[PDB]
Symmetry: C12
Subunit: 140 residues, 12 copies
């Protein structure tokens, strides 16, 4: 259950360097944004993007120093199990891809998903972040 909404974006190159930078945490799950960061970064690598790097603890101040072409950022709106025994997992994420040249959001997505009650939070998140980030798969 849930939906995914994507704007169009550029076809990314295998050699386009991407900085994953502070994914905001708007939930009461500690480190939820950090989990999304890790999950996102590996999604971006699995999608064929050779050089992907997560920022440390504007932000473009940094990404240029790492000679990144783009910055992937976002926020997590929901990341938890619903309350009670057999509460299903629920994830909600937004993502922005930023062109480091001008600071302009060239691609954006929103995805939410409510899981099976016999599913893990990490599983749903991981699946959703992969579907949401699929247009950032490297072009053939």
């Amino acid at each position: 259950m849930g939906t995914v909404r994507q704007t169009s974006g550029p076809a990314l190159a295998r050699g386009d360097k991407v900085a994953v930078v502070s994914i905001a945490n708007y939930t009461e799950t500690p480190d939820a944004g950090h989990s999304a960061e890790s999950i996102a970064a590996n999604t971006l690598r699995a999608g064929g993007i050779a050089d992907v790097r997560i920022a440390p603890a504007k932000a473009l101040e940094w990404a240029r120093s790492q000679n990144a072409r783009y910055v992937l950022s976002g926020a997590v709106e929901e990341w938890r199990y619903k309350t009670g025994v057999d509460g299903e997992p629920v994830v909600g994420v937004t993502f922005e891809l930023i062109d480091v040249s001008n600071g302009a959001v060239v691609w954006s997505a929103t995805g939410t998903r409510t899981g099976w009650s016999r599913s893990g939070l990490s599983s749903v998140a991981t699946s959703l972040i992969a579907k949401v980030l699929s247009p950032l798969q490297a072009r053939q």
Copy 2:
């Protein structure tokens, strides 16, 4: 629930819109910031090419500011509690400072629905008149 939208301008893809401080009148922390992030993306998905999230709007060359407030953003109490969202929006012409467009939307979802889904879906419908 419901959605009510007033008349408003026909938006162009090159019209710069700046999303600014969506108030949280709920007990869910960061409800407003979540509403900002979803709104910005809704606008971009609606074809507004340049949307930024924060007077300030002028220095960012924005034509319009999108603002508003969240009135409800939560699961109802108990297990199987259903997600409830309530939001108001206002679209502001930056040159004169006037509300040119405003809207209000509420929604209650199924028991097995995510709150983030309801909110995202609702915010999409409410802001649907700001696409082109």
Copy 3:
């Protein structure tokens, strides 16, 4: 369920400027008055009133500076879910329209409503505030 009681009032103009000013909160729901403020303001716009503005954090000191013709104020007497699982939402509001020239209450209303237990608080409130504020719809 519930009732709405309205005094007569003037037929408002599309170009009558209205200031929405501090709606008292007499409930234990934080920001309940602020929610009513936002809801009310958009109701007033949806009703055809072009220039509607909510005051910041007598009060007529301000409304004249904004050249407002009227001030809509009120209070919230109830704004909550009844207690327990499946507690129905309940709203209770009063509203006064003030002529900024003389300070006189020219129109007033009281509305209460108990919702469906499968309804949101925000939904009931929004519906009730719209019915209550309907005589402030702009004249044709």
Copy 4:
């Protein structure tokens, strides 16, 4: 419950009435202020053209002051707890300072009734003799 009203003056639409400090003898915060707001509106709806909410009454040129106290204003305990309101009112001639009219009303509502409804409905009936 019940309502008992004493005799009182025939009120005129131009008689200025000032609602003043309705005591809260309940554990529901702002019960009295809620009773003030509902009363004022009841009076206006009853045709009193000028009703204001706060010696002081003289400086506001009021003929009468409406006052009173709330004795009960709550849901009964437990889920399905029924709303209970109890109120006393007194109408005061400002020139001499005498109670010219007084009334007492209590009411218990259905389980599925709002407290704000009961109170509003009750306060309407109690103050019904102050209309014209």
Copy 5:
């Protein structure tokens, strides 16, 4: 349920001024004595006693200054809902009428009442205080 016990008393005049003065609160219901004060005062007016006044926050020091002929005082022994869901309301009151000339209790009453479980505390109290205070109705 409950009983009312009354001594004889004088037949009060419509123009006999009465001061309602500090009704003691012997319960754990806050303001219970104040509620009885308000309820009592209006009962006394409804009973045909023209000038009735409640004292502010012996006491005869005051009542003479207000030229009162009598003082109605008392205490509340019980004023609550019995414990638990559907606990019936229970009221218990005593009342003394004092002649301001000499300080002598010329009339006295005790009333208790246990209510219907679907009844309000305020309703039972109000009814009981009216029955208890009925001999202080003004003579024809």
Copy 6:
């Protein structure tokens, strides 16, 4: 429960009786003061024309002092807990200082009985020998 009264004087309507400090040996606050107020009224209803509520008794010209203590004054625990009262009284000749009359009464009521009723009813029976 029960009531036991010793012999005592035949009281006259003009005999001034002063009720003085009825001890509270319960966990119900003001139990004793409630017992004082009910006692005073019982005495007046019993035809004692002058009863006052506080050595001191002499300065008030009282012939007798009524005193005592409350041993139980509560609802039994749980819902449907029944009201339980237990009281002792002593009547004192003020001139010599001797107990001339004394009595003890206990009572348990129905589940649907008020505590104030039980106490009032019990205190009436116990003090019934002090009427005339």
Copy 7:
């Protein structure tokens, strides 16, 4: 339920003055000893003992000053409702009568009683203290 055990004692006179002095409280019921004091004193009067007096807050220092012939003292070992809803009342008392001349215990008793669950603590106590103190009834 329960038992009463009594030693023999003197036949007391109607004019034998008795001081009731500090009945120890060995329970977790506050004022339990004081209740027994009051109950005992009236039992002693009801039993035909004309002058009976309870001491204020050895002890024979006092009783001689009041010209008492005897002192009735004791302790309360149990005075409570058993735990839970419908817990029966339980009383346990010991009593000593002291000759003020020599300080010697001339009469002593122990009584315990478990009540009906629909009985009051005060009722059981009162009944038990009366049975226990019955040999101190005045001789004919």
Copy 8:
């Protein structure tokens, strides 16, 4: 439970016995003092004419001292918890200081039994050899 008594002296009615400090090894406050009071009375009822409750014994001219300790003195847990008592006693010749008599007794009662009853009954049986 059980009772075990050792041999001991034949007590005379004129033998002065002084009850001294019965230790409380329970969580029931004053268990030992309750055991002292019950013991003293048991001894008197058993025909010992002079029994007093507190080296010291010599200055009171006592022949014997009765002492001991309480090991259990409580209701078992839960509603319907049964009362449990456990006590040890020792009888001491004051001249030489030797235990001349000692005894141990435990008892569990019915659910509907008072703790004070069990203890009193048990303490009676245990000390029964000190009567004459």
Copy 9:
């Protein structure tokens, strides 16, 4: 239920003086060791040992001053009701008899016992301590 394990020991004399000295408390029952001390001492007397004395609050420093021939010591490993309503009592004790001449453990025992759920802790303890200490019965 439970077992008792005893080493052989000497046949004790009726006139062998025994000091019962600090029985360790290894449970969360306060005074458990003290209870065992009292119980043990009387067991030793009931077993025919004329002079038995419990120490106040090595230890042989004391026992020699009392001219004791032996010291009985030990520890309590368990002394409680099992958890919950109708939790059976459980006792666990070890005992050492010490020759005051040389300090050598000449006799030792371990006993545990789980009681009937309708039994007292004090009863089980008392029974077990008596069985465990039975070889210290005086020889005929």
Copy 10:
């Protein structure tokens, strides 16, 4: 759940790998250190002869660094709560500093499964491409 691995180098038994600081993004204390210990052993079992657990890697002559983060490591709530693990890994060439290999794995186990088992089993599968 699932496992996704990117391409990576063919590892040799003599390639020194150093496991370094696996972040804990869970509320289970030491989740990351547990993940480090299991990973190191998985690598050794996979035939990497020299694996050490902590710039630093250079001074230890390591060719590769294995790192990552734990996103979930817990039993689901309630009794019969099922164990849930979620992990990301990255393999880093020490000379240039580049990720040459990366992987993500999640897993939910039976109710009667140990958490340590799930994690160990999952971490084995995820790192299976780093064996030779």
Copy 11:
């Protein structure tokens, strides 16, 4: 559960053994001291004539030291929780300082079994090779 014992010396009745500090790795206070006391007695019952409970061992002329640790010593949770014991022992030659004998034993008992029984019984079996 189980018991595993290594080989060890044949003990003589005159071999002095000193029990020394048995570690408590449980949340049951004094578990180790309880294990010391039971062990000492087991050894004595096994025919070791001189067993003492505390380098030090030399000054006490002991040949061997018995030591160890408790890993579990508790009732399982809930009512009817079964008692669980787990212990390790080591026997040490004092002259050289070497472990000459070591053993490990665990045991779970019936619901209606005492913890002290399980432990005592288990410790008996584990140490059974140190008898003669």
Copy 12:
């Protein structure tokens, strides 16, 4: 239930001295690592390794001073009962054998096990640690 995974290792000698050194505790069971230490040490002795010693409260600084040839270390990842009544015991351990000459891990193992709900934690642990450590049994 559970698994055991072992790398190959050397065939250890009966006279190869082994130091058991700080087994990390990654659980919320206090002393879990210490229990594993004790259990492991005796497993190593039972496996035929004559001289086995546990370290006190790199670490190779110590093992050389004790002339140890190897160090057995590890960590405990899980050591507890699952939550609730009848929660089964669960153990999870890793182990490293270190050559004291060079500091190199020459043998390593991971073992987890979920027990029977009518089993003790100590029993499962003990069994698992013995299976896991079986290749460190001394060669014939």
